[PDB]
Design a protein around this nucleic acid. Structure first.
Lengths: 118, 154, 128, 84, 101, 60, 215
RNA sequence: GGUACACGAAAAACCUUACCUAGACUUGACAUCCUUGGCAAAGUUAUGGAAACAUAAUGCCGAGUGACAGGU
RNA sequence: UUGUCUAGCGAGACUGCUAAUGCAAAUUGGAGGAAGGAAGGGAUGACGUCAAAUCAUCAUGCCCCUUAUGUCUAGGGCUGCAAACGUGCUACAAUGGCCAAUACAAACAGUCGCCAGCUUGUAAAAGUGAGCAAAUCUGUAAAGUUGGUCUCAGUUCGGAUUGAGGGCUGCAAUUCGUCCUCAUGAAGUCGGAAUCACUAGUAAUCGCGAAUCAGCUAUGUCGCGGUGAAUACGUUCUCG
């Protein structure tokens, strides 16, 4: 994790500008600590800047969140697993058909000449 | 071809009694919704009354008068080249397209709230400095060279 | 006594009762003011266009019950009931009201769409 | 994936495993269920699974076994990006 | 009273044949028993079934067929077995069925 | 084949989801109509002569 | 292409072949899938019976099937020769416990059925009988029987390869765009040594004045 | 092309299904033309088996032989 | 805040009347009505045309197979993959995004079912428990309004992909079902060339039901209902 604050706005959306904690887990932290974002001000108390990090670390660690997610990815990669096999080589694995889609995992375009005369 | 078909008529506004305001209602209307459009309407009149207070009407038909078009473009051909010449057009279509220009230049603004930007193009057009009058100037000016077939219309 | 009126619009209807009593009446429907049942918007003047253009609201009640439809059709139905009551009470105004075209509803309802149509007239986007 | 049975085996693998883990010295087993997912007590073996073309015999991992046994091997053949 | 709450429901898949059967039965039950309430008209169960016409490539050239089921109610509290006997003189046609409780 | 499909359909399976519905005189699982255990072509052709009691051309 | 006009007047002017109902998609499907085959039996079984029609009547699991023909002389049977076979095949087709019985009769003006004429021309096709004699015989017979103008057409092999010849004949008025006409249609496929011959016959019973209710 | 391309095909994880391969399969899975049977046809379960499927009783009823059917 | 409503029988618009101009036919206005000049719509496709489509609905003339193109189940495949088309969806936004409260239907279906409701749950759902073989029982209608926030920017936009966990059916969800909770947050600033559809309840937009099916990423199909515009001058061109 790190230290990040919105430009000048409510306290809660600071949780949006940190990874591993989206809007839902943000509201979860708020209802856990009973701290509501006061109007367009990020400064109400000084102790909260480590108090919120306590419960955030209690959930899990941001960088470690992604670290063990990537570890899980390479765990599919290490042993023979069709899910990992397709996930490693830039190709979708779920029920999505790979004949007209998957471009977001492919670069913008790599089109080449085709043979439609036959 | 289309033989003859009278168009629909508008009804007087219950709180304005102005055909022009009804055409405003029509042009800014989107997605088949009146209430949302009517909110923009109420905000527009209220803010025109608020900032530099005058008379919603006086400025309204003032802008309408300033944006009154002269000649509208239509295209003919020799079957191989398009030539655009302006001809006349009744007042109802003139007003409809003028208010359409106003609304289109309204939506193509980048300020925050709709009501304030709407009042902005309205007062700009009433001041003969908005973008609505520029296309009118262009449609009047192009007739300088399009007179060749503006003389003989087919 | 009361005036039996019926209004119809968009497959919705409305029964209307007015009285010649000594009360100016209060516009209401569904046991609430139209400011809370109908949208609190321009329709407040729309639902009373004939009564504010003729026979100002000073000598009758408002006992109207609605059935079905959305809300704009409800306004048309209640207006049709109002004009029906106005006609049956004072038919002499029949000449001066029909010019305004406040007569029966003009059967404009959503069509009965068919196969190959998206709005009963929209086409399937003909291609090459 | 059953949420009532941690990994729903077809229950015909049970016969093969109660044979094999008792024998526990001939790793290739002639049994194949693309819908089988092993429990921790059915781990450490190879599985001769019929692809529908050939009988592929591959060894299974010992760390995450809560996955389909046919999901550790390709279900069909594929090829590179189309240029021919 | 002899058999309270004769609530007999009649079912047919037409309105004209429905008219015929309703007329027949609610007029034959007159002549023997009193206190028969009017047969309450009932909504018609309409089913449109849209069907592809060609056995091949089109989803726009589809016809559509109708199946409409009709029903009528007779609620009889105060009666005698005379109406029950009268039920066995002129038979309802084969396209109409009865529901009872 | 065509007839053996009909034969195996009329049989009884061991699990309860093996069943697939079709018509019995002219059965076509492709665009099946289990509304009356019939087929689309079958219903259309029987409707032309009037073999169904309650069949009518749709009216709106 | 076009659609048989028998369905255009079915449901508003034409009588129902079957008049019955039951619980939806519970036993209606089975009952209809049985009695449709029951109906289709006789025309396939018999070609020399000139049967007019069949009629299914079901009343709460009580089922019977009327049959009507032109001349039941070969359908009643000597000392009930046919009726015993009819009863046996009826027990064959629809269960063994259901009530089963019928009666054979003749409808008024049996000559005005398209089915009998279509079967006659099919006999003229399956017997390798020439086409012109059959067509002229049908025309003169329907003219002298007494009726309004009818029509007929044929399609298929006419003793020659590259089938592109089909013949149509029409007399009087045949208003296929008219609600009330009470006009019958038949379609038959005759088997020949060169293939299948499809023949359509539109027989005009005659429009009835002020048809306000089903016949 | 108009007159295919939200199509046939209003449901491709068994079936759907024609197909790649495994196991079996032969007057025939199913039905019909002969003659003998009027009560045993399913299902049942340890048996081998990934799976058809055989050994154990149970519970239009039925054998052989020929006459062939079926082909998405 | 009871005779609206469901639906049978009918009545009712027929150039019926008049001014108007015409040999006639037929023409525009006015009265009236619920509606005036095919009241609005569906349903009703002549001969042919391209031998267009289906010998895989069916029947089916040829030829061929037959201890085999016949049978039975496992499993795989009809879903891949540089691409492009054809069609949706939904963004690129403060008419908006999210949050609380609040206005209102039609039809339509429901018997191994429709599921009122209770309790357990952030949730898929679970245990449970009434009416409905159906005008009595069932299926938050939303857009809207009261506001609150977001404060004008790659945003509480957009929600893709992927990951973790939970949920249901199904012998089973890997191939190739899907729902929800949580994690991330893809391109993207209105789309040149060209186009497609549309004359008022129209387009656009918002929601409900039915369908095959055990269930289903059907955004699709079939309909139902709500809000609800613009332009029609005109036929030189463009398609028939």
């Amino acid at each position: 994790l790190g230290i990040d604050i919105p430009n000048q706005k409510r306290i809660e959306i600071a949780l949006t500008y940190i990874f591993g904690i989206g809007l839902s887990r943000s509201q979860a932290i708020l209802k856990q600590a009973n701290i509501n974002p006061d109007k367009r001000v990020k400064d109400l108390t000084e102790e909260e800047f480590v108090a919120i990090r306590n419960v955030a670390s209690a959930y899990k660690i941001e960088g470690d969140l992604r670290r063990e997610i990537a570890l899980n990815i390479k765990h599919l990669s290490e042993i023979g697993a069709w899910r990992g096999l397709r996930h490693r080589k830039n190709l979708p694995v779920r029920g999505q058909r790979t004949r007209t889609n998957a471009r977001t995992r492919k670069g913008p375009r790599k089109t080449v000449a085709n043979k439609k005369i036959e | 071809r289309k033989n003859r078909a009278p168009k629909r008529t508008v009804l007087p506004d219950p709180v304005f009694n102005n055909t022009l305001v009804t055409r405003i209602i029509n042009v800014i209307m989107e997605d088949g919704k009146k209430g949302l459009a009517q909110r923009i309407l109420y905000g527009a009149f209220d803010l025109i009354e608020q900032r530099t207070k005058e008379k919603p009407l006086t400025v309204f038909e003032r802008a309408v008068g300033n944006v009154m078009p002269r000649l509208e473009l239509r295209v003919r051909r020799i079957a191989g080249s398009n030539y655009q010449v302006p001809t006349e057009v009744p007042q109802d279509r003139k007003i409809a397209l003028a208010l359409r220009w106003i609304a289109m230049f309204a939506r193509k603004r980048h300020e925050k709230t709709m009501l304030e930007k709407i009042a902005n193009e309205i007062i700009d057009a009433s001041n003969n400095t908005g973008a609505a009058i520029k296309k009118k100037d262009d449609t009047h000016k192009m007739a300088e060279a399009n007179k060749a077939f503006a003389h003989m219309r087919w | 006594q009361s005036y039996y009126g019926l209004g119809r619009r968009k497959s919705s209807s409305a029964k209307v009762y007015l009285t010649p009593t000594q009360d100016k009446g209060k516009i209401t429907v569904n046991r609430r003011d139209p400011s809370e049942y109908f949208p609190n918007k321009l329709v407040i003047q729309d639902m009373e266009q004939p009564l504010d253009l003729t026979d100002l609201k000073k000598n009758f009640d408002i006992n109207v019950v609605v059935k079905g439809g959305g809300f704009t059709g409800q306004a048309g139905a209640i207006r049709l009931g109002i004009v029906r009551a106005l006609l049956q009470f004072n038919p002499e105004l029949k000449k001066i009201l029909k010019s305004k075209k406040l007569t029966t509803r003009d059967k404009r309802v959503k069509e009965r769409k068919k196969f190959g149509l998206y709005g009963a007239r929209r086409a399937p986007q003909f291609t090459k | 994936r059953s949420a009532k049975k941690g990994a729903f085996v077809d229950a015909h693998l049970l016969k093969k495993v109660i044979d094999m883990n008792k024998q526990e010295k001939k790793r290739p087993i002639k049994t194949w269920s693309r819908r089988s997912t092993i429990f921790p007590e059915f781990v450490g073996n190879t599985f001769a699974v019929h692809n529908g073309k050939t009988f592929i015999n591959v060894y299974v991992t010992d760390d995450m076994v809560g996955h389909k046994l046919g999901e550790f091997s390709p279900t069909r053949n594929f090829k590179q990006h189309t240029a021919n | 009273v002899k058999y309270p709450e004769l609530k007999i429901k009649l079912e047919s898949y037409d309105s004209t044949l429905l008219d015929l059967t309703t007329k027949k039965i609610v007029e034959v039950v007159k002549g023997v028993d009193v206190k028969i309430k009017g047969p309450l008209p009932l909504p018609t169960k309409k089913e449109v079934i849209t069907i592809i016409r060609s056995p091949h490539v089109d989803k726009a050239s589809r016809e559509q067929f109708e199946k409409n089921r009709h029903k009528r109610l007779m609620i009889l509290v105060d009666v005698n077995q005379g109406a029950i006997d009268s039920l066995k003189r002129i038979k309802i046609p084969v396209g109409v069925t009865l529901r009872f409780s | 084949a065509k007839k053996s499909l009909k034969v195996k359909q009329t049989r009884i399976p061991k699990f309860a989801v093996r069943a697939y519905t079709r018509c019995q005189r002219c059965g076509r699982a492709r665009a099946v109509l289990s509304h009356f255990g019939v087929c689309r072509l079958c219903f259309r052709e029987l409707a032309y002569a009037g073999a169904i009691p309650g069949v009518k051309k749709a009216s709106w | 292409q076009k659609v048989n006009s028998n369905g255009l007047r079915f449901g508003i002017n034409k009588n129902w072949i079957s008049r019955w109902t039951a619980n939806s998609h519970a036993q209606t499907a089975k009952w209809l899938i049985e009695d449709e085959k029951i109906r289709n039996l006789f025309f396939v079984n018999y070609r020399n019976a000139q049967v007019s029609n069949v009629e299914i009547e079901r009343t709460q699991a009580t089922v019977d099937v009327f049959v009507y023909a032109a001349q039941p002389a070969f359908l009643i049977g000597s000392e009930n020769k046919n009726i015993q076979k009819i009863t046996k095949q009826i027990k064959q087709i629809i269960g063994r416990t259901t009530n089963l019985d019928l009666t054979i009769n003749e409808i008024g003006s049996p000559m005005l059925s398209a089915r009998i004429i279509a079967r006659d021309l099919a006999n003229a096709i399956e017997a390798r009988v020439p086409l012109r004699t059959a067509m002229r015989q049908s025309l003169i017979k329907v003219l002298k029987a007494g009726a309004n103008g009818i029509k007929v057409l044929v399609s298929g092999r006419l003793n020659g390869a590259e089938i592109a010849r089909d013949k149509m004949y029409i007399e009087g008025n045949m208003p296929l765009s008219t609600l009330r006409a009470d006009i019958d249609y038949a379609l038959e496929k005759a088997q020949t040594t060169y293939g299948v011959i499809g023949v359509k016959v539109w027989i005009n019973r005659g429009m009835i004045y002020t048809k306000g209710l089903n016949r």
